[PDB]
Symmetry: D2
Subunit: 265 residues, 4 copies
């Protein structure tokens, strides 16, 4: 018996096989889940990547800025999972910020049009996906998004930090809506994992500073350490939330960061 045996779970956000979503999906399939996957923009590349998962899973296109994609999403999921079936889980593992909003670009020089796009994709879309998909979720279901602790400012993360703060607030409102369906909504505040988006943050000249700051903020603080090349602990944590084993947690944030955020130094 797998942790997610018989659950139907939608997973967004696979772009490469380092993607946090790829590992969430891998672990969920290892634990008996039937997945629907969504991908943005490079669908043929993404299909090649999702072929490396342990099991087959249909891949549906979703650009969270596209109103038509969102309006048709539930119908397209239903068609993939079979009429009369519903989702037990939804994973939002999606983010974006234009280059002006991150890295060494001065914080004040990001135009609002760029910041707005970032907040749309990174924060608002958590609400939009929940809106689209709650109508096809079973009671006892679980919506999970990915967070990066924005409680304190930090170098480089800049306007994405602002977007994460927004996302945390959105998650608490999504929980209010989701509760009417017997559905939980939570975020996983992950420690740093080496992904495509991670390399986009400085995106350059200061790659060395990024690694140094990450080692100082996370592995050095974490009482159990932190390995940025191992997404499994994060994937497992997301699977815990998708499971029946955190049935009283909603509107909330679970930290999968080796305990770093609990330690000052």
């Amino acid at each position: 018996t797998g942790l997610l045996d018989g659950k139907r779970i939608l997973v967004s956000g696979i772009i490469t096989d380092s993607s946090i979503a790829f590992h969430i999906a891998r672990v969920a399939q290892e634990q008996g889940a039937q997945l629907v996957l969504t991908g943005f923009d490079r669908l043929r590349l993404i299909q090649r990547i999702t072929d490396r998962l342990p099991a087959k899973a249909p891949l549906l296109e979703l650009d969270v800025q596209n109103e038509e994609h969102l309006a048709s999403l539930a119908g397209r999921v239903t068609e993939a999972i079979g009429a009369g079936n519903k989702l037990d889980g939804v994973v939002h593992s999606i983010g974006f910020m234009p280059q002006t909003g991150m890295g060494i670009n001065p914080f004040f020089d990001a135009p609002y049009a760029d910041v707005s796009k970032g907040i749309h994709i990174s924060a608002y879309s958590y609400a939009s996906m929940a809106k689209a998909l709650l109508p096809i979720m079973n009671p006892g279901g679980s919506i999970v998004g990915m967070d990066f602790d924005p409680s304190r400012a930090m170098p480089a993360y800049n306007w994405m930090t602002v977007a994460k703060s927004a996302l945390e607030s959105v998650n608490r409102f999504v929980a209010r809506e989701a509760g009417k369906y017997g559905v939980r909504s939570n975020l996983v505040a992950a420690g740093p994992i080496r992904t495509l988006a991670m390399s986009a943050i400085v995106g350059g000249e200061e790659a060395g500073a990024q690694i140094q700051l990450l080692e100082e903020g996370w592995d050095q603080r974490a009482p159990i350490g932190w390995n940025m090349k191992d997404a499994t602990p994060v994937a497992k944590t997301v699977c815990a939330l998708l499971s029946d084993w955190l049935p009283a947690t909603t509107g909330d944030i679970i930290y999968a960061d080796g305990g770093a955020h609990t330690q000052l130094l």
Copy 2:
């Protein structure tokens, strides 16, 4: 000797004489500050309102969505305060959310275009104003914005809650920039005050506000009295919180410290 004697302070956000900014401005003038005021959209109304302040102050137009207003702001402040003078303080007391983003409108039905406008005015603009004005601020200066505690979701406040969360995060980054100028940046998380914006968001509203605030506050909370809020903002503009930045001071009667 007033608390803000000899300080030059820009105050945004006066629309009526209930405005939190109106009271911030009144108290700051009572404490010896020389003000510059900024107003949005209803300049003739705002001029009538600012005539009720204890002292005269120049009023400059500022729509925080207008790039040209922001690009000319510092020059227009400098011309009002006299060349070679700088600001000691900046008050951001500004917000907006379209009707779709608040009240009884379902949370999921606010389009992003509306939420975005709200975030632009209510959060991003804190950074915009700091960008425009830090180059004309003295060391030891203070930037203050108004917050409403968004740590927990609540009825009605909806997407404005999201905007306030964004604002809190923006404030922490503004503090990093402002520190290079020897300038502090902080928010005041105020309890509820009867203002124009409040009526934009009424018996259930007042009951919820009384439950969240006065009933929790160990010293009580009076929604018709802006003075405690204005004083708190003046404390932050003063020299008396010189080691506080990137931070949030709660002027809410202690409500947020009490569960029930």
Copy 3:
């Protein structure tokens, strides 16, 4: 099959079958754990209660104020689980405050001797148990304590609120120590559950404010919780504790998981 298949877990704090520890233990056995149980003071009563668990488990005496009990604990656990075996999990589900520290007794009238006893049992003992047991824990293990959100003051909970604040701080230090053994330490901040200790806060189920206690609990929890909250159902709490004892939260330590229906995320 089970979430805790093959794990050896110590569970403290069973006094009745409403005890949060009793449900933690029940769920853990349903999920394939082998338990060792510890009990305080009323060992014969507790033995009768633990007979109602799904499976047999040895019961060992532990008064967390007793230095000798703590010094012999690991040896007595080892003898119960078999030499060469170690624990995978430890559950601290223990608390105490004298009556002067709770309820309608004025906050300022609790003498420090009483508050101190409360803090000793309710907070310091989390460190004591970890000290005693980490030497017999496997890497990958998990220590879990029970919390009640003390971030804001509230009526009645009074000095126990202070003890919980202390416990949260202790948990973060225990995490630092436990990390050296590859062991996690976390608390579960539970919503309210009707237990013996709950009734002791107002001086009994009959206590003068029992009515106000239930009203405040309904206002603080079920009314705020987006998924509701049932004070008569410990299962969601027990499951949450079992999640932490499992391998499924492997990157969480020094931390607090809220099993409160999401109440703490909502203002009203």
Copy 4:
């Protein structure tokens, strides 16, 4: 003219002229306050130190573990300020932890007797002082205690961290009581300041790692603070305490003001 013109303020915790309480008292007198001072144990030393304040102030003995001192405190303050006068302000700037509770001494080896003494003096006493003095405080008054941010664990601070967590919780309950008198209760979470407790007590408990201390403090504070942090300058902290004693934070209670250069708002 002064921020605290005409206020009567009690200040505890002066032991040397580096004491945060000494600077709180200095600044308060510069701002027009009439003080009553309390000191512990070394009254002759403390009298010499308080002579270096800008104005004379009566000094009363107070050992916060001594029940008789607490029971007589109000009467002895009243006699110093004149019958029928009340205090506007009370400053708690008092702490203690035995060396076993700090530094390089292992966290698990601190006996509870030592921790308890620490918590008594550093946390419970905030309640005891408020109990003694609220009956002689005017409406609009202010009680202020000193905090060091214990939200996250850290090296060395150990069980004092636990005590500060307890103090924060105590402060929220003191606020509930104080509100009935129209009185505010708040803490100032200060950045690190070179004092006797810092250097001798915390420094001493670090033993052969005493040299680490400045490096750890610079990493936690000045490096994070957007306006920097100077450990040799207590004035920003003193001013912050005076802000809270003033009428200029009239809607803040049960709360914590951070006078740490903004360090706690920045991750790195």
